[PDB]
Amino acid sequence: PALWPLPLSVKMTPNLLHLAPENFYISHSPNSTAGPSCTLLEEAFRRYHGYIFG
Amino acid sequence: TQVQQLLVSITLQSECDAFPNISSDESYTLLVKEPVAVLKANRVWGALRGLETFSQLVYQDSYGTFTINESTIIDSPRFSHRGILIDTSRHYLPVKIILKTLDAMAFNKFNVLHWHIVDDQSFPYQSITFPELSNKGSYSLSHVYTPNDVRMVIEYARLRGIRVLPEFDTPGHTLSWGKGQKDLLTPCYS
Amino acid sequence: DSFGPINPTLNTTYSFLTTFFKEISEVFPDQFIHLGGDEVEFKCWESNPKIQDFMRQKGFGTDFKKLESFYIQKVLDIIATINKGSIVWQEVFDDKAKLAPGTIVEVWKDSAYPEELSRVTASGFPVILSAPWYLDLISYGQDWRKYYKVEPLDFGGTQKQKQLFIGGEACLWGEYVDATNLTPRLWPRASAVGERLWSSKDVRDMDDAYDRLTRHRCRMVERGIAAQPLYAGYCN
Amino acid sequence: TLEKNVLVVSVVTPGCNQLPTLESVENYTLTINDDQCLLLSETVWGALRGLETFSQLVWKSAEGTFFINKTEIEDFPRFPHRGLLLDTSRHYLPLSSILDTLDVMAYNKLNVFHWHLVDDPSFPYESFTFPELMRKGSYNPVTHIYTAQDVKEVIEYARLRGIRVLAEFDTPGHTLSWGPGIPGLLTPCYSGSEPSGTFGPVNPSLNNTYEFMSTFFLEVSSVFPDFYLHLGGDEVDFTCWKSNPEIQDFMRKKGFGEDFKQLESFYIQTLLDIVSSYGKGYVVWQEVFDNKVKIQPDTIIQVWREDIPVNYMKELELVTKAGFRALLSAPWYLNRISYGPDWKDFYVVEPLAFEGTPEQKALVIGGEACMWGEYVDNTNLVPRLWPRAGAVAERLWSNKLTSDLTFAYERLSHFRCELLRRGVQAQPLNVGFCEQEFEQ
Amino acid sequence: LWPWPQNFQTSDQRYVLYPNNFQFQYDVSSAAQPGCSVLDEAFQRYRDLLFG
Ligand SMILES: *[C@@H]1O[C@H](CO)[C@@H](O[C@@H]2O[C@H](CO)[C@@H](O[C@@H]3O[C@H](CO)[C@@H](O)[C@H](O)[C@@H]3O)[C@H](O)[C@H]2NC(C)=O)[C@H](O)[C@H]1NC(C)=O
Ligand SMILES: *[C@@H]1O[C@H](CO)[C@@H](O[C@@H]2O[C@H](CO)[C@@H](O[C@@H]3O[C@H](CO)[C@@H](O)[C@H](O)[C@@H]3O)[C@H](O)[C@H]2NC(C)=O)[C@H](O)[C@H]1NC(C)=O
Ligand SMILES: CC1=N[C@@H]2[C@@H](O)[C@H](O)[C@@H](CO)O[C@@H]2S1
Ligand SMILES: CC1=N[C@@H]2[C@@H](O)[C@H](O)[C@@H](CO)O[C@@H]2S1
């Protein structure tokens, strides 16, 4: 896999899924007590999309 | 065959605009599925650890295709205080390098930066109330952490769910304090 | 004509420590403030006439453990007074001093440190462990294993005592550490500690830890963290 | 008064186009008074030394005013062979890292770059005679490689500083990476009657093998201009040889019996004959000597072992009382790190602290700090190297007498802040600071 | 000064240096004169170290 630290429960399948840089979106669920006003999350959201791809 | 979106869902009251404390719930549950993968956590902090976990699951295959195995993760920390102790007294650490340490803590799911900021050798902390402390105790006047430097660290560590716990060691390890505070230090006779 | 520790006999000192710690309160938004109280040298206090008077004034005799306790309790109140918790090195708990419930004790000494883990949690204080993970103390070889091996919960105590163990710290004291050899020395040696504190108690398999760590060390490097290699190999 | 010039005058002539050799002369005088400002050296190589010394003597007041002092200096190295070993097999080292390592060796007056190119896990050297060595040996046949171009840069770079490049292609041991690319070269080890997937050291029983080395070491000797080559021979394991029956058969025919020490001697002799016929001399680790191998009387033994089989100071005695020239590496192992300032342990050594006659002690030609690479790569190299290897640098250049640790510390720390000003990522020696802190 | 010279005679008597208006020049009688690669570069590299 590659996880560090190792989570408390990791259940993996052999089935693959593919992602698209100029087409992948990290956004809030419509039923979540934090939305597009959340500085903290909005920041991470942008930062990580960088780490994941880059 | 595609992951089109990762949706982040905060369950309880976000704590979105706060500073994390010793009892901040960092638990999350992750779902990697098509077409839309989902990350859920009670508080904002969990989502931080979860987005970190999620970055460690995507990879490029033999052909540079971006790929993630579909999976179901459920994760909470065993311990709630997981810190690094840095000493910026015995040598001055350029503010940039403290930031990189945080990023590296963020990748490593550490949540406390024990900042042993002062000691016998130097007093780098620029006090607002006692400005002579740095002025006379610091290694030199460039080797100083101005308020805004220290502000920047705390706001930089917040955006990665790290708490900054400062340490001002007393009554030992204080030889530098009495460079700018007369009579504060017991004088050695004999 | 050298100096000693801070002078606990004057109330210049404590009026200074107040105005100062009130500033700290407003600079650092964290609930707790580490006061330290470690390696407190009684050599100088002892050879001071003015201080020797104070010792009769309160009837401490020549037990400097008490004068130390007095000072540290005078401070703990300054902090509790300013709606902040406190963390303190194990000496303070070990020179017999009154600490307000909720006061954190960080264990840092090797000598019977699981016994120190016992005392601190038997006397109803929360504890942080740092003793086994002295990261400044470098040595040749894959010493990340020795840090990965520690099991913090191996000491005497009822299940109710283990709830008071809240976590640990990896310590990089700067005596031989600055900007030039920090990132290499810290990482990935601290990552070991990172899994220990986060992951389950029964996550100890060396071959897998190695396997995941080497690949995690590269991902660190890829994200611009100059972490050192665990062993011969490569990235990319 | 003021000074506007340094006059540099070299007496010996051999251009500035030939590479330095073991016998080159590094003497110089630095005379700076009212009437003059003269850097006078014998060889061009002495001049580089002088120029360094000179750069370091420059200074500036709290006002910032650039000053040099009245100074009279006559200097020369204690030992001719003051080297530095780098291991680019256990981890690959980018070319920039190697060149930067040569810049610092310069400042420290080190004059031999010992390049441990290849070893068990990695074969980063590209062979054109045997392209398949690098192709199936290296970590990644494009990213982690040394091109004929890379290697020529290192050599010229080093030469421009007065650094000789000593190539090491360790044989017969430490050769697992050669296995793929050249088939049959390695010894296939045996369980009891059938091979066990595991491969040992270079197989000395086959003709193919000697034909390989003969072709390959022609290449090696073409590429590396220095007169000397390091041929290795450390930690050779007899376990895999003895286990193999085909080799056991070869032992009976030459009449070697049961000791594989002289089987080893068979290989090395042949290998030293090969290298000798291309006009090259050779360094060799101590094991060859300890293993009583028939060895040319011009060979150089590099002592690396502390205790077994004999104390490293006794090794030095034994090697020299037998007439061979000696390198000392044993107590200068920069890979073996320890808490606190272990530079004092390197500085404190005295290479001529053994039972011997003046001319017998005269066979100690210098030594090398070794930065083996198991735990070291691009990420932690520089700070680990400096200023710990500088302790050796002075031990090998300066006088037997210069040994006071306080006086050492005072200067090495002042030198270390200077390394910092020159962009070197040297680590602290203790508590404190440099006013211009390392930030990059 | 690292490493320590064999014979180094030192003084407090000092002289002024002019970063830019400073040069390294081979004496007439020197065996090594311009065209000397090793020192042609050296002279350049050290004036960058000293005054870059
Ligand atoms: C380069 O520097 C070296 C080291 O200073 C010079 O070598 C030394 O020269 C001296 C002076 O003659 C030699 O001392 C002599 O030795 C003989 C016996 O060997 C003795 O009987 C004489 O009374 C005299 O003292 C010394 O041996 C020699 N070597 C060393 C290592 O010190 C060398 O001359 C310099 N090169 C040039 C050409 O300037
Ligand atoms: C070349 O000459 C200059 C000028 O004389 C020397 O400069 C000076 O360095 C000395 C010695 O370090 C300084 O003197 C003192 O240092 C001691 C030791 O800590 C301290 O006790 C004194 O109070 C004072 O600081 C001096 O300040 C400084 N400049 C002057 C005006 O003297 C320089 O050292 C000489 N170079 C060498 C390598 O000899
Ligand atoms: C807690 C500790 N307090 C001390 C520190 O002040 C020193 O710097 C350190 C040396 O590494 O040793 C102990 S650890
Ligand atoms: C000569 C030598 N050969 C060995 C090397 O292959 C190792 O890398 C090194 C590690 O310390 O130890 C000895 S030194």
DSSP result, C59-97: T-TT-HHHHHHHHHHHHHHHHHHTT-EEEEEHHHHHS--
What span, in angstroms and rounded, lies between the C-alpha atoms of A41 and B16? Answer: 8
Residue among D56, D59, D60, D72 to mutate when testing ligand 2 (max atoms within 8 A of CB):
D59
Q: Which of D139, D374, C221, C67 shows the shortest CA–CA distance to B186?
A: C67
Give yes or no for residue D24 CB within 6 A of ligand 1.
no
Residue pointed to by tokens 């954190």 = C104
| C-alpha separations of B181 from C39, C181, D277, D388 in Å | 22, 33, 77, 38
What is the chain E residue with the closest CA to D34?
E15
Contacts of D222 (CB under 8 A, 6+ apart): none
What is the CB neighbour count within 10 angstroms for residue B99?
A: 15
Report the DSSP beta bridge partners of residue D364.
D326
Tokens read off for C161: 């005592």
The token duo for D158 is: 């080093």
Residues D129 and D95 in one domain: yes
Instruction: Find the DSSP H helices in D286-362.
Output: 286-290, 312-321, 343-347, 358-361
Chains in contact with C via at least 3 Cβ–Cβ pairs below 8 Å:
A, B, D
Q: Using alpha carbons only, give the angle D144, D145, D151 rounded to the nearest 5 degrees.
A: 140
Of D76, D97, D119, which residue constitutes the final position of a domain? D76
d(CA D220, CA D358): 36
Q: How far off is chain C from D249, nearest CA to CA, in Å?
A: 36
CB proximity list for D359: less than 8 A, separation 6 or greater:
none
Query: Residues 67 to 96 of B: which have CB under 8 A from any C CB?
Result: 77-94
D143, amino acid identity: T
| D432/B121 Cβ within 8 A | yes
Q: Distances from the Cα of D35 to the Cαs of D56, D67, D70, in angstroms?
A: 22, 17, 11
CA E8 centroid distance within chain: 17
Q: Domain of residue E17: give its range.
A: 1-52
Query: Distance of CA B132 to CAs B149, B169, B179, D174, D194, Å?
Result: 18, 18, 8, 61, 80
* Whether C1 contacts B188, CB under 8 Å: yes
| Residue of E1, E8, E10, E12 to test ligand 2 pocket, by largest number of atoms within 8 Å of CB | E12
Question: Which H helix or E strand runs over D1?
Answer: none
Alpha-helical regions (H) of D326-387 = 343-347, 358-361, 381-385
Distance, in Å, from the CA atom of B163 to the CA atom of B81, rounded to the nearest integer, reads 10
Tokens of E10: 């030192």
Provide the 3-class DSSP secondary structure of residue D32: strand
Min Cα distance C227 → chain D (Å) is 7
CA–CA distance, D4 with E15 (Å, rounded to integer): 10
Cβ–Cβ under 8 Å, residues A31 and B14: no
Q: Residue D70's Cα: distance from chain center in Å?
A: 36
Lookup: tokens for D312: 């490293």
Judging contacts by C-beta atoms under 8 Å, the chain B residues touching residue A46 are none
The candidate with the shortest Cα–Cα distance to D8, out of E45, E50, E29, is: E29
Over its C-alpha atoms, chain A yields an Rg (Å, rounded) of 14
- Amino acid identity, position D426: A
CA distances from B69 to B49, B56, B73, B129, D322 (A): 19, 11, 12, 56, 66
* C-alpha closest to that of D92 among D145, D46, D31: D145
Domain count, chain D: 2
Amino acid at D195: P
| Strand D66-75, strand D28-32: pairing | antiparallel
Q: Looking at this protein, which amino acid is placed at residue B18?
A: A
Contacts with D245 (C-beta within 8 Å, 6 or more apart), sequence order? D190
Query: Could you tell me which of D154, D210, D209 has the C-alpha nearest to residue D185?
Result: D209
Q: Determine the Cα–Cα distance for residues B120 and B124; give it in Å rounded to an integer.
A: 11
Peptide bond into B35 cis (omega under 30): yes
E strand or H helix at E11: strand E7-17
Determine the distance separating the centroid of ligand 3 and the alpha carbon of C109, expressed in angstroms.
Answer: 10
Peptide bond into A7 cis (omega under 30): no
Three-state SS at C206: helix
CA distances from B24 to B73, C29, C43 (A): 20, 14, 43
**Cα four-point dihedral sign C225, C228, C229, C230:** negative
Residues of B in contact with D437 (CB under 8 A): 92, 94, 143
Contact flag A27-B109 (C-beta cutoff 8 Å): no
Q: Are C130 and B75 in contact (CB under 8 A)?
A: no
Nearest CA in chain C to A48: C223
CATH code, domain with D88: 3.20.20.80
Residue D297 is which amino acid? P
Q: By three-state DSSP, how is residue D388 classified?
A: helix
Q: Domain check: are D68 and D82 in the same one?
A: no
Question: 3-state DSSP call for residue B135?
Answer: helix
On the CB side of E6, how many CA atoms lie within 13 Å of its CA?
Answer: 16
Which residues of chain C from 55 to 84 reach within 8 Å of chain B, CB to CB?
A: 68, 71-72, 75
Task: Determine whether the shortest distance from the Cβ of D65 to ligand 2 is under 6 A.
Answer: no
Q: For residue D155, what are the domain limits?
A: 77-440
Quick check: B139 and D439 CB within 8 A? Answer: no
| Cα B104 from chain centroid (whole Å) | 9
Residue A17: list chain B partners with CB under 8 A.
1-3, 32-34, 37, 67-70
- Cβ of residue D27 lying under 6 Å from some atom of ligand 1: yes
How many CA atoms, within 13 angstroms, populate the side-chain half-sphere of residue B113? 28
**Six-digit token string for D256:** 């070697």
How buried is residue A47: exposed, middle or buried, by Cβ count under 10 Å (0-12/13-18/19+)? middle
Q: Decide: C99 and C74 in contact? Cβ < 8 Å.
A: no
Q: Which of D105, D57, D193 is nearest to D385 (CA)?
A: D105
* Dist. CA C110–CA D188, nearest whole Å: 48
CB neighbour class for D70 (10 Å; exposed up to 12, middle 13-18, buried from 19): middle
CA-to-CA separations, D198 to C188, D374, E48, in angstroms, rounded: 32, 21, 54
Report residues whose beta carbon is within 6 angstroms of any ligand 3 atom: B 173; C 38-39, 89, 108, 136, 173, 175
Using a CB–CB cutoff of 8 Å, tell me whether C227 touches chain B. Answer: yes
Calpha distance C169→B76 (Å, rounded): 18
Coil, helix or strand for D99? helix
Per-residue b or e along D393-408, where b marks 16 or more CB atoms closer than 10 Å to that residue's CB: bbbbbbeeebbeeeeb
Q: Any idea which residue has 């990896």 for tokens?
A: C170
Taking the centre of ligand 1 as the mean of its atom positions, its distance from the CA of residue D221, in whole angstroms, is: 34
Buried-state track B156-183, b at ≥16 Cβ within 10 A, e below 16: bbbbbbbbbbbbbbbbbbbbbbbbbbee
Whole-Å CA distances, E22 to D1, D4, D53, E34, E43: 15, 5, 17, 17, 11
Q: Which residue's alpha carbon is at the smallest distance from atom 32 of ligand 2?
A: E12
Task: Name, in order, each residue with C-beta under 8 angstroms of B184's C-beta and a sequence gap of 6 or more.
Answer: B174, B177, B178, C6, C7, C12, C13, C16
Element holding E17 (H helix, E strand) = strand E7-17
Token look-up 């008074």 returns: D33
Return the best residue to mutate from B86, B167, B170, B173 for the ligand 3 pocket (most ligand atoms within 8 A of CB).
Answer: B173
Distance CA C147, CA D391 (A): 31
What residue type is D288 in one-letter code? Answer: V
Whole-angstrom Cα distance, residue D291 to residue D228?
Answer: 22
Tokens 């690094």 locate to: B84
Give dist(CA D87, CA D329) in Å, integer: 14
Taking contacts as CB-CB distances below 8 angstroms, the residues of chain A near B40 are 29
Q: Which of C198, C215, C219 shows the shortest C-beta gap to A5?
A: C198
Contact D237, D173 (CB under 8 A): yes
* Type of residue at D108: N
Say whether both D197 and D288 belong to one domain: yes
- E strand spans, D264-376: 281-285, 300-303, 325-328, 364-371
Listed by number, the residues of chain B in 127-146 with a beta carbon closer than 8 Å to a beta carbon of chain D are: 139-140, 142-143
Q: Which ligand is closest to the CA of D11, given by its number?
A: 1
- What is chain E's percent helix, strand, coil content, to nearest 5? 30, 30, 40
Residue D340 touches chain C, beta carbons under 8 Å: yes
Sign of the CA dihedral D13, D17, D23, D28?
positive
Binary contact (B139, D433; C-beta < 8 A)? yes
Residue D61 sits in the same domain as residue D88: no
Q: Which residue of B has its CA nearest to A26?
A: B6
Count other C-beta atoms under 10 Å from residue C58's C-beta: 11
* Distance of CA D311 from the midpoint of ligand 4 (Å): 18
State the number of CA atoms in the 13 A half-sphere of E13 facing the CB.
11
Query: Which helix (H) or strand (E) element contains residue D410?
Result: helix D405-421
Q: Which residue has the tokens 């008490």?
A: C66
The residue from D76, D96, D111 where one domain ends is D76
Q: Which residues contact C77 (CB under 8 A, 6 or more apart)?
A: none
Determine the atom of ligand 4 nearest the C-alpha atom of D374: 8
Please say which residue of D76, D110, D127 terminates a domain: D76
Same-domain check for residues D105 and D42: no
CB of E31 within 8 Å of a chain D CB? The answer is yes
Which other chains touch chain B, taking contact as 3+ CB pairs less than 8 Å apart? A, C, D
* D with A: touching (≥3 Cβ pairs within 8 Å): no
Cα C183 to middle of ligand 3, angstroms? 19
Chains meeting A at 3+ CB pairs closer than 8 A?
Answer: B, C
Residue E10 Cα: closest atom of ligand 2 = 39
Q: Which residues of A touch C219 (CB under 8 A)?
A: 2
- Give the contacts of C207 (CB within 8 A, at least 6 positions apart): none
d(Cα C46, Cα C61) in Å, to the nearest integer? 11
In this structure, the number of other CB atoms found within 10 A of the CB of residue D330 comes to 22
Going by CA atoms, what residue is nearest to atom 27 of ligand 2?
A: D61
- Measured between its terminal Cα atoms, the distance across chain C in Å is 58
CB B75 within 8 A of CB B29: yes
Ligand 1 and D418: CB distance under 6 A: no
Q: Looking at this protein, which amino acid is placed at residue C30?
A: D
Position of tokens 């060390």?
C217
In chain A, which residue's Cα lies nearest the Cα of C192? A5
How far apart CA B23 and CA B95 sit, in angstroms, is 28
Calculate the alpha carbon distances from C49 to B24, B182, B188, C60, C70 in Å: 50, 19, 10, 15, 18
Spatial CA neighbour of B48 closest among B98, B103, B101: B103
Alpha carbon distances (Å) from D303 to D119, D287, D333, D365 = 19, 9, 12, 12
Using a threshold of 3 CB pairs under 8 A, tell whether chains C and E touch.
no
Element of type H or E holding E23: strand E23-26
The one-letter amino acid code at D71 reads T
Structure tokens at D89: 């097999």
Resolution reading in Å: 3.2
DSSP character string of B114-131 = EEE---SS---B--SS-T
What residues of D act catalytically? 235
Judge whether B26 and B46 are in contact, CB under 8 Å: yes
How far is the C-alpha of D367 from the C-alpha of D397, rounded, in Å?
10
Is residue C31 within 8 A of residue B21, CB to CB? The reply is yes
Shortest distance, CA B2 to any CA of chain C (angstroms): 24
**Can you tell me the distance from the alpha carbon of B17 to that of B43, in angstroms, rounded to the nearest whole number?**
11
**For D280, how many CA atoms within 13 A lie in the half-sphere containing its CB?**
25
Could you give the 3-state DSSP secondary structure of residue A49? Answer: helix
Q: Are residues D126 and D33 in the same domain?
A: no
H-helix or E-strand containing C155?
A: none
Asked if A8 contacts B74 with a C-beta cutoff of 8 angstroms, the reply is: yes
Residue D417 and residue D369 share a domain: yes
Radius of gyration over every alpha carbon of chain B, rounded to an integer in angstroms? 22
In whole angstroms, give the CA distance from residue B14 to residue B161. Answer: 13
- Check if the beta carbon of residue D286 is closer than 8 Å to that of residue D259: no
3-state secondary structure of D267: helix
**Same domain flag for D50 and D155:** no
Same domain, D288 and D351: yes
Cβ distance of B91 and D433 shorter than 8 Å: yes
In what helix (H) or strand (E) does residue D49 lie, and over which residues does it extend?
A: helix D44-57
DSSP alpha helices (H): ranges in C82-143?
A: 90-94, 113-122
Domains in chain E, number: 1
How many Å from the N-terminal Cα to the C-terminal Cα in chain D?
38
Same-domain check for residues D174 and D299: yes
In whole angstroms, what is the distance from residue D389 CA to residue D391 CA?
A: 5
Tell me how far apart the alpha carbons of residues A53 and B16 are, in angstroms, rounded to a whole number.
26
Please indicate, yes or no, whether residues D125 and D216 belong to a single structural domain of this protein: yes
What is the spatial distance between Cα C224 and Cα B157, in angstroms, rounded to a whole number?
A: 17
Q: Are strands B163-170 and B112-116 parallel, antiparallel or unpaired?
A: parallel
* Interface residue E23 vs chain D (CB under 8 A): yes
Which chain D residue has its CA at the smallest distance from E49's CA?
D422
As a whole number of Å, the end-to-end CA separation of chain A is 20
Would you call C117 helix, strand, or coil by DSSP? helix
> In the structure encoding, which two tokens stand for residue C71, read together?
């000072």
DSSP H stretches of helix in chain B: 44-55, 95-107, 132-137, 147-158
D53 and D103 share one domain: no
E48 C-beta neighbours (distance < 10 Å), count = 9
Residue whose CA is at the smallest distance from ligand 4 atom 2: D234
Q: Where are the alpha helices (DSSP H) in chain C?
A: 11-27, 43-46, 49-57, 64-81, 90-94, 113-122, 144-149, 159-162, 182-186, 189-198, 206-222
What does DSSP assign to residue D106?
A: H
How far apart are the C-alpha atoms of B102 and B108, rounded to whole Å? 9
Residue B10's DSSP bridge partners are: B41
